[PDB]
């Protein structure tokens with residue numbers, strides 16, 4: 001009894017990557033169900049779900065309208081959603097119709113899913129869940145996460161500079177418009193204080209940037 | 224620190240073509256070269272000397288903020304600059320497609336592009352990073368942490384199991400599709416054709432021995448999969464160049 005249209009999102013109550021898909025889905029006006037799996041009971045490893053996501057992790061998204069197509073990596077899901085919306089509307093919302101812009105959005109998106117999220121996750125593990133407490137390991141990742149934020153900080157700082165040379169405004173990573181590249185960081189920005197990173201104090205531009213995204217109803221509507 | 228050489232480059236950039244900033248010991252650097260080669264895109268490679276801090280060159284950091292390799296400059300597109308191996312592959316297959324109409328190593332169907340993307344993000348997010356951490360604690364950390372090594376080594380084997388399970392399922396599909404003597408026919412991750420999804424793993428598959436993983440014995444399907452790709456000329460030329 002699978003739906004004819006719409007979407008179903010598998011996630012976790014604590015998953016920042018799961019929230020990343022919820023935000024995009026709501027921002028694009030797509031209709032969706034949300035099934036939160038309970039890891040403790042190994043629902044993310046049960047056959048029926050590995051059939052959906054071979055990697056057995058959330059998020060995962062079933063595009064009912066597309067014959068129950070399963071897209072499983074959070075980054076792949078975003079690319080699917082913005083591609084789907086552009087194709088249906090002709091409007092590259094949170095995306096771009098220009099190939100050069102697309103390459104940039106993807107650059108920041110891969111940077112986020114591959115160099116920002118994993119590092120924050122390793123920082124969280126060694127600090128709260130490792131079988132042993134090792135500071136060198138915790139420091140390795142908190143340091144790397146700070147380097148990453150320094151990268152986005154420097155980027156936004158230059159977008160700011162450019163804007164100012166154009167005599168209080170929001171600045172974005174690509175094409176001076178909100179995109180999945182910017183939204184990909186939101187769920188994680190909101191949790192790094194758990195590893196001792198105070199964005200407000202340490203990364204001013206990132207603080208503004210993230211403040212602008214948290215004030216969006218579509219980002220609140222699902223958080 | 225001396226990057227005068229890198230600064231000179233950004234003063235005189237070719238009309239068109241591609242310049243690739245890589246490093247001889249960077250698997251993702253070669254992932255790009257492979258695809259670049261498979262698509263017939265002519266490119267020159269500059270191996271950044273991190274020891275000399277060339278990656279700190281203002282002209283390089285401008286083109287690529289994360290100051291890490293690989294990074295590709297598309298001189299034909301006003302010297303556009305893509306800085307993530309995953310974003311570089313997508314740019315290449317897309318550019319190739321609109322220029323020829325033949326989605327080589329790609330797909331023209333949205334559903335297939337999504338499946339390819341899944342495996343691509345997976346390799347860049349769950350594959351490469353975990354192998355990186357495994358190598359780090361095994362050989363480069365300031366101290367020895369056995370548990371940290373076991374953790375990432377366990378994860379690298381887990382992610383390989385996923386690819387193995389996936390390739391095994393594709394195998395059975397093709398077997399019970401005309402039948403066995405078809406136990407060594409080439410199998411691919413999506414659409415029964417080689418795509419950037421399969422190619423993304425090869426440079427790294429050759430590195431996992433350093434962390435004690437033996438693909439040929441522990442992951443048979445992954446082994447056949449790697450060998451088929453390894454015998455392609457474009458591949459050989461890339462890993463060799």
Ligand SMILES: N[C@@H](CCC(=O)N[C@@H](CS)C(=O)NCC(=O)O)C(=O)O
Pocket residue numbers: 012014015016017039044056057058059072073074075113344345348349
């Ligand atoms: N690269 C993946 C990461 C997926 C991921 O880390 N999922 C977590 C959510 S916190 C999960 O399922 N954790 C359960 C587990 O590790 O057992 C993506 O962005 O989709």
